[PDB]
Design a protein around this ligand. Structure first.
Ligand SMILES: [Ca+2]
Ligand SMILES: [Ca+2]
Lengths: 19, 67
C-alpha cells in the first residue's frame, strides 16, 4: 500500500516550490 | 491544486498526458523510497479507477484529493 507515496512526490512539488 | 496539475507534467516525461508505470518509476524512485516494480504497479493499481492501468487527469485528481 504505497498510495501515500503518490502524494509523496506531490508534496515534494510543493517543497520544490518553497525551494 | 496548482502543484497537482503541474505535477502531472513533471511526472510525464514522454509528453503524452499519461503517467505510465515506467514514468512513475523515475518519479517515485528519485523521491527517495525506491520500491519494487510490483509496489510501483500496486501504486497505480490503487490509483486507477477507470480500469486502464494508468493514472489520467481525473483519476489523479480524485485519488489525490479524496473527499
Ligand atoms: Ca508519459
Ligand atoms: Ca486509469
Amino acid at each position: 500500500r504505497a498510495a501515500n507515496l503518490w502524494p509523496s512526490p506531490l508534496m515534494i512539488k510543493r517543497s520544490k516550490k518553497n525551494s | 491544486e496548482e502543484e497537482i496539475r503541474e505535477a502531472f507534467r513533471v511526472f510525464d516525461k514522454d509528453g503524452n498526458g499519461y503517467i505510465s508505470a515506467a514514468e512513475l518509476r523515475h518519479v517515485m524512485t528519485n523521491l527517495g523510497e525506491k520500491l519494487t516494480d510490483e509496489e510501483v504497479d500496486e501504486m497505480i493499481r490503487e490509483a486507477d479507477i477507470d480500469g486502464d492501468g494508468q493514472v489520467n487527469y481525473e483519476e489523479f485528481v480524485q485519488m489525490m484529493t479524496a473527499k
